Amino acid sequence: HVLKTKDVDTVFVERQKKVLSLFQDVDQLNTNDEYYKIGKDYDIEANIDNYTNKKAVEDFLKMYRCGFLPKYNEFSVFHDKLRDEAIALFHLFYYAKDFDTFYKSAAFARVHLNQGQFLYAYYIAIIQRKDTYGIVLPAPYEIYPELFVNIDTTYKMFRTKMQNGLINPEAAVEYGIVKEDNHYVYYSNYSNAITYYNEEQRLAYFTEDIGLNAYYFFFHIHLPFWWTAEKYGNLKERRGEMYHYFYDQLLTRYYFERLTNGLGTIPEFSWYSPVKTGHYPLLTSYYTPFSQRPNFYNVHSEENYEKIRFLDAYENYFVQALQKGVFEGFGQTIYLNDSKANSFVGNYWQDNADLYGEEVTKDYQRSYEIVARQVLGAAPKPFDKYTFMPSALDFYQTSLRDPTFYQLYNRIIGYFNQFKQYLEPHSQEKLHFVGVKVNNVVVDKLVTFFEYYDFDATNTVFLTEEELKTKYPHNLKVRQPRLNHQPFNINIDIKADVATDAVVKIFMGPKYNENGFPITLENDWMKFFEMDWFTHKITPGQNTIVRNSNEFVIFKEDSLPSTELYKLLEKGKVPFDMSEDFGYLPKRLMLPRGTKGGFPFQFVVFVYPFESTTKNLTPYEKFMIDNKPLGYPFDRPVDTSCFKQPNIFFRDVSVYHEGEYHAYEYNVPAYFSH
Amino acid sequence: HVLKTKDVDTVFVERQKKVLSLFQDVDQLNTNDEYYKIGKDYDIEANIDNYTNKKAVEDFLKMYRCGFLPKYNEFSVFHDKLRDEAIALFHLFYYAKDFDTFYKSAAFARVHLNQGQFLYAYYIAIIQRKDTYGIVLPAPYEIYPELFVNIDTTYKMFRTKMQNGLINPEAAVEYGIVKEDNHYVYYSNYSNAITYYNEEQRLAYFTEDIGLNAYYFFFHIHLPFWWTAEKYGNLKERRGEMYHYFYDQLLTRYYFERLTNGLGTIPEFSWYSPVKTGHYPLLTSYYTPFSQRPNFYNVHSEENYEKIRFLDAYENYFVQALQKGVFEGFGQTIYLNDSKANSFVGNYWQDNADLYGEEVTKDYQRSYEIVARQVLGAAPKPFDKYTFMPSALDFYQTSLRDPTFYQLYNRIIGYFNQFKQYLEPHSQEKLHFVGVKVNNVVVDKLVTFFEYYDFDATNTVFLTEEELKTKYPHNLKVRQPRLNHQPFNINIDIKADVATDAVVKIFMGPKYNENGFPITLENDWMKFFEMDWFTHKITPGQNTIVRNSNEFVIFKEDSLPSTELYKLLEKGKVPFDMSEDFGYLPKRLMLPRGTKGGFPFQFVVFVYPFESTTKNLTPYEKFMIDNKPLGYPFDRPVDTSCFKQPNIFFRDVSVYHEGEYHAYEYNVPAYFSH
Ligand SMILES: *[C@@H]1O[C@H](CO)[C@@H](O[C@@H]2O[C@H](CO)[C@@H](O[C@@H]3O[C@H](CO[C@H]4O[C@H](CO[C@H]5O[C@H](CO)[C@@H](O)[C@H](O)[C@@H]5O[C@H]5O[C@H](CO)[C@@H](O)[C@H](O)[C@@H]5O)[C@@H](O)[C@H](O[C@H]5O[C@H](CO)[C@@H](O)[C@H](O)[C@@H]5O[C@H]5O[C@H](CO)[C@@H](O)[C@H](O)[C@@H]5O)[C@@H]4O)[C@@H](O)[C@H](O[C@H]4O[C@H](CO)[C@@H](O)[C@H](O)[C@@H]4O[C@H]4O[C@H](CO)[C@@H](O)[C@H](O)[C@@H]4O[C@H]4O[C@H](CO)[C@@H](O)[C@H](O[C@H]5O[C@H](CO)[C@@H](O)[C@H](O)[C@H]5O)[C@@H]4O)[C@@H]3O)[C@H](O)[C@H]2NC(C)=O)[C@H](O)[C@H]1NC(C)=O
Ligand SMILES: *[C@@H]1O[C@H](CO)[C@@H](O[C@@H]2O[C@H](CO)[C@@H](O[C@@H]3O[C@H](CO[C@H]4O[C@H](CO[C@H]5O[C@H](CO)[C@@H](O)[C@H](O)[C@@H]5O[C@H]5O[C@H](CO)[C@@H](O)[C@H](O)[C@@H]5O)[C@@H](O)[C@H](O[C@H]5O[C@H](CO)[C@@H](O)[C@H](O)[C@@H]5O[C@H]5O[C@H](CO)[C@@H](O)[C@H](O)[C@@H]5O)[C@@H]4O)[C@@H](O)[C@H](O[C@H]4O[C@H](CO)[C@@H](O)[C@H](O)[C@@H]4O[C@H]4O[C@H](CO)[C@@H](O)[C@H](O)[C@@H]4O[C@H]4O[C@H](CO)[C@@H](O)[C@H](O[C@H]5O[C@H](CO)[C@@H](O)[C@H](O)[C@H]5O)[C@@H]4O)[C@@H]3O)[C@H](O)[C@H]2NC(C)=O)[C@H](O)[C@H]1NC(C)=O
Numbered sequence A, B: 001h002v003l004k005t006k007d008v009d010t011v012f013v014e015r016q017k018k019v020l021s022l023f024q025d026v027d028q029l030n031t032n033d034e035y036y037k038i039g040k041d042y043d044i045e046a047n048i049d050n051y052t053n054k055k056a057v058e059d060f061l062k063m064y065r066c067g068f069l070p071k072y073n074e075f076s077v078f079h080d081k082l083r084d085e086a087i088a089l090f091h092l093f094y095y096a097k098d099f100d101t102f103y104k105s106a107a108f109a110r111v112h113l114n115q116g117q118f119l120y121a122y123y124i125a126i127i128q129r130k131d132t133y134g135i136v137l138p139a140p141y142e143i144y145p146e147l148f149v150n151i152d153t154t155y156k157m158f159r160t161k162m163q164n165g166l167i168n169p170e171a172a173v174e175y176g177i178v179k180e181d182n183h184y185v186y187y188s189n190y191s192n193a194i195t196y197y198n199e200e201q202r203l204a205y206f207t208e209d210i211g212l213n214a215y216y217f218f219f220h221i222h223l224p225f226w227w228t229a230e231k232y233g234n235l236k237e238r239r240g241e242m243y244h245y246f247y248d249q250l251l252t253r254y255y256f257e258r259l260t261n262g263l264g265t266i267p268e269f270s271w272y273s274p275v276k277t278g279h280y281p282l283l284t285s286y287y288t289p290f291s292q293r294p295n296f297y298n299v300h301s302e303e304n305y306e307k308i309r310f311l312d313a314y315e316n317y318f319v320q321a322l323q324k325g326v327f328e329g330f331g332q333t334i335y336l337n338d339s340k341a342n343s344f345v346g347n348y349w350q351d352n353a354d355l356y357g358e359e360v361t362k363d364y365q366r367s368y369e370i371v372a373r374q375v376l377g378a379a380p381k382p383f384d385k386y387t388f389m390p391s392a393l394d395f396y397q398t399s400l401r402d403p404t405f406y407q408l409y410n411r412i413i414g415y416f417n418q419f420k421q422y423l424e425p426h427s428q429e430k431l432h433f434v435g436v437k438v439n440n441v442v443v444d445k446l447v448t449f450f451e452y453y454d455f456d457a458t459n460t461v462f463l464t465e466e467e468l469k470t471k472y473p474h475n476l477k478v479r480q481p482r483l484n485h486q487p488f489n490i491n492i493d494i495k496a497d498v499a500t501d502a503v504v505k506i507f508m509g510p511k512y513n514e515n516g517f518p519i520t521l522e523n524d525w526m527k528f529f530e531m532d533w534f535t536h537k538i539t540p541g542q543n544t545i546v547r548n549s550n551e552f553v554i555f556k557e558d559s560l561p562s563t564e565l566y567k568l569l570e571k572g573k574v575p576f577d578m579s580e581d582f583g584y585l586p587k588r589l590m591l592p593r594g595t596k597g598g599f600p601f602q603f604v605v606f607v608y609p610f611e612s613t614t615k616n617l618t619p620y621e622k623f624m625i626d627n628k629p630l631g632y633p634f635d636r637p638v639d640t641s642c643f644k645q646p647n648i649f650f651r652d653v654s655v656y657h658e659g660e661y662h663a664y665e666y667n668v669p670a671y672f673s674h
């Protein structure tokens, strides 16, 4: 298994090394590094001519002269002041006329501003600026290790750095601390191996997977809710569509993990009753432990009355719009069948900039999601604008760790899916592919297993004045057994009459509902996980297609550590996926953990005529190369019919799991010491 | 300290004497008085030609022939039938062609109608009729002493009257009954000296202050929610602005009293959870005690299910309008920034006539304030249209005695202040006064203390057939120590470039929040109490202004008993404030009770260019002589800026309290007997 690579020129390489020079030892400043001198004395005012937008720069300066979030404090985009500052900073980065002015602005920020705040605006700018297109971003877990690993292993790294090494390596092994080469390796367990407060803990290997969490972070920085989608041209008109697709797909995938663990559907809650599923983040900031929400949390308390009424009102509005058939307000009146209605509900639920026709949201345009994250996070109200007790719900990099995150968005998609039943359902004729028929589909054995995975966590530690004189160590390694599966083929048999360009899609869906009974397309159309999308020229007669799971376009390879990125740069290359598909879900997670006896699911292949791609979303996500609605044909209900189309095939499938069932078993000292 | 007086001609004096002739021994009828014969035989039908609006008079007769509230029963403008009768009566009074016809109509009413009802319509007619403009109104506590004093002292007066004097004066002293001259003086404690059911009771000297309660009553009769603001020209368009101003100032002032008493912010509540703070009115009607709301009252019971859904719906509508950026309904469509928006939210929350574009409100036009006062009052449903158990929330003269009164309006203004954040914030430029700078502000020591205050409470008692044959006694006096403060100067130091006409305002704001930390303008702009407003001619160079607290235009002098009014009329004079500023907050209450060590607050002086006064509200309140929104520049949030404007100055201040801290200490027999 070789990783696909891509060729880059000398300019790109030079810009790549520059951006990476600002992603090192992020919680500390190195006066020996070139960036410190540049950044410390950069005069934004004096170079105001090197920015395409003078107003944005002046607003930044005006804001900056008043002070920004101090260093070391936690930064969260869900807090007004912090967000506005971060956004002003983003504008300073985005409007730099050229890479050089941008780099200097970045260095300025790195030296003067809050590390978290800088990293946030930095990450987004690299994604948004045209001149940095293709630039490979370092893994978020490598940049925010304190957000991707529990305190028990963070504390072990702290103890190692404080002791300046291992004092008794033979004893350290019993605490998962091993030395390999010149690296210190830390075997890190998911939380279900240290605390089991509720049954949802059984899903910890999935909800705490660094790749899954990185995936949500990438989703957000690819296109922040506070920013307009203008830059992406077409996506703007299809933004709400993308919202639905992303969350439906994520919720459905999470649902599958629940199913193979016997946890049933995503729980429903009320803002007027205790929230059943609590959550205890084993994370910490530099000033406080993350807030905890005990099981059966009394959410309807005096501190949340007003917020709950707002959330209620927000839901009420939508439900009433569905009833009367029209969305009023926001400067327009949309009937449910309007051609922009789909984008409206999506933008409405997310309360994004595009809902208002602006480039950035304002503080007074209150958000359902932000307020809901606030009350579900269970944190006491902020001490002040710059100080708050964070919860898993305050970061896109830790959101998926909280069971209520899925419950919140499942509630939202719940309404979105209700809205979809008011639309014209897909007719049997529009779904039919005259001349095309799928005679059979055979799927190879589906097997999951846990496999060790390492990543650089050195950013967890603080370097010595002497250590800063020499090259960075990239000394610490965090090792966790992560979910994965064996590659598998899908053999498709297609009997055709005429020759035509066809599109073939591969989905994965449940076979039974939570109670073990047969699924129903009428109520379960939204439970199909899109796995593949590709064009294929169908020749008259017999057509045999073989798609290997490693080829599914929906997923990407694991990221490589910054150190391997450099070696690859010497060759004038960059990982293909890491550069162009950084937002895709890691392929090692395309399958939910199976069971020893094999858990029931079904694959489905659908092939339809290839045609218009005039309003595709390639500038956003590469695989979106058609005009059909995202998730087609499971994007909305379908005109109930008891006789399936010949161009769609459903194949039963079983997901088995090999090796140790529980991930923590691979971190038992007796085991890894062999 | 001399009280300001105003000269009045003979015509005014005779009308003043005529109006006061109907404010004597109000719960009884005097056949020996001139008004009795006049009112008993007055024929409205026959004199219909003396009313400018015949339809109104016919409606009154049609309604009167069916019967009105009987004598002795409690009257409240919050009960449908009662309000409708009162409004009909008002029209009869208002449409009288000349003073004489008005007086007869009033005499007729005094004789035939419910005393409370008559007094209600009468008070308002005197304020609204043009020919009675300036006519001095007797203090509400003199007219309705049973609404301004607890039953313990009401019963003492009853006992005195029944015994026809004191049987054992030496002994009566131990109960606060003392004879002075020809008066019987009753030392009257606030409820916190007889029952301490919850911590809010420590605010009783304030919430029960007769002046504070009279103030709210004056606010009502000056312009009832059921009547249109048409009479006041410009006010009509700014009605909502005045609504926000009145309640925000009152709520802020209340907040200040909580701060010096360690009671923090105004509590928030939910219609679906027990209301924490109860209230026990130590008041009674002629037929029943006032209803009581115990602590942690179960408000969400079957009797209130439907009313709560209404209240909840009313709030939902506002919250959704804010979210969609437009107010729909009531015959129009108003975007948040529309020029008519501010008045809409005001008229909406109040459910007043101007909301519907009518003269007076109708029964089916359900009111949030009324329904909320109904469920918060905790009284069982009315026996019938004429019989109900009253709560402190059923009267404008007792409302401030109930903690939930503040909680309810704080909830409404919460929404109002939320709406304010959707408006164009005051820009730094517009707040800047070019060439004008406030160099310094010095405030003399702020000191509060309790000082005895007496008022005529003879209306509490019933007179003898013989006593009615001679002049009214004005025999009984209620004595209570009331909050007060020493006069203080505010020295303002201004450095100007050129000469201009400037407006200088003075505010009092908190220094710290309820937790003891620094206030923030972005979140506490609504907590600034306006204290003074005046024009001043600034000359080039150094300017020095000296304003004494006694000169603040926002406050008035205490009311004089009706007996002192007569003596003053004989000199062709009337108190200046009682005549033109009756609705102003008593100046003795401008400062919250301080603490021995001195409680922190801050004074702010802001000076801006004097200009337009085209849409001023002088006809309503004298001090509103500008075009600026009421409360400027703290009427809405301001473009956040850490750099203060040169024409504004903040000065730390400490409010000290001298003498006994608790008011009841002055009502201890050992103390007042010396
Ligand atoms: C415990 O607990 C407690 C309780 O809580 C606490 O306390 C706290 O604390 C805190 C901290 O400390 C604090 O805070 C702070 O404060 C401070 C002070 O303040 C003040 O002052 C200021 C200044 O002033 C000045 O300036 C101005 C301008 O700007 C002007 O105007 C004036 O006049 C003056 O002048 C001057 O200046 C200068 C000096 O400085 C010179 O030039 C000369 O001298 C001149 O003359 C100011 O600004 C302020 O203001 C304020 O206030 C007032 C009143 O008072 C007012 O009026 C105003 O307006 C303002 O206010 C307000 O506003 C609003 C309200 O409405 C809001 O917003 C707020 O409140 C505000 O405030 C005063 O006066 C200060 O300084 C600081 O600052 C800082 O921080 C912040 C945040 O926090 C930011 O924003 C800013 O920016 C800054 O930053 C900085 O720092 C930090 C740390 O801290 C960091 O992180 C950052 O990064 C930065 O850094 C920088 O700086 C530093 C110093 O500063 C240094 O060191 C550094 O360096 C380094 O690094 C670099 C790189 O980067 C390198 O290169 C090198 O090498 C190294 O070295 C840098 O440079 C703050 O703010 C508070 O306050 C307290 N609280 C209380 C209640 O008290 C404690 O802490 C604890 N403790 C423990 C142990 O834990
Ligand atoms: C206990 O508990 C119990 C239970 O709760 C109770 O009971 C109650 O009681 C009550 C009280 O008493 C009652 O009520 C009452 O009643 C009565 C009776 O009724 C009946 O009758 C009437 C009358 O009739 C007549 O008239 C007419 C017209 O108008 C006609 O039509 C007829 O026919 C007749 O005629 C005749 O007679 C006359 C006389 O009157 C002559 O002219 C000749 O003879 C002729 O022929 C009537 O109206 C009524 O009716 C009604 O009802 C029916 C049924 O039955 C019906 O059908 C009808 O429609 C009617 O209505 C109804 O209905 C509706 C609808 O549904 C409703 O709303 C209701 O139901 C109604 O009702 C009958 O029949 C009566 O009378 C009375 O009245 C009164 O009151 C009221 C209120 O309440 C008012 O509004 C009115 O106006 C009146 O008033 C008066 O009185 C009062 C007192 O009470 C007062 O306050 C006032 O102010 C007034 O006064 C006046 O008068 C009097 C007499 O009455 C006198 O006395 C006085 O005198 C004074 O004056 C001056 C001062 O200002 C001086 O100057 C001198 O000097 C002095 O003296 C005055 O004048 C009532 O209503 C009830 O009923 C019961 N309930 C039950 C259930 O039963 C008890 O009470 C208790 N007890 C204890 C002790 O606590």
Ligand SMILES: *[C@@H]1O[C@H](CO)[C@@H](O[C@@H]2O[C@H](CO)[C@@H](O)[C@H](O)[C@H]2NC(C)=O)[C@H](O)[C@H]1NC(C)=O
Pocket: A331, A356, A357, A358, A359, B325, B335, B337, B424
């Ligand atoms: C009054 O409201 C309108 C719309 O609600 C505001 O107009 C918007 O202004 C922003 C600029 O910040 C534009 O990006 C939008 O396209 C405008 N939308 C519409 C519908 O006009 C207007 O700014 C508000 N009034 C003021 C003075 O700001």
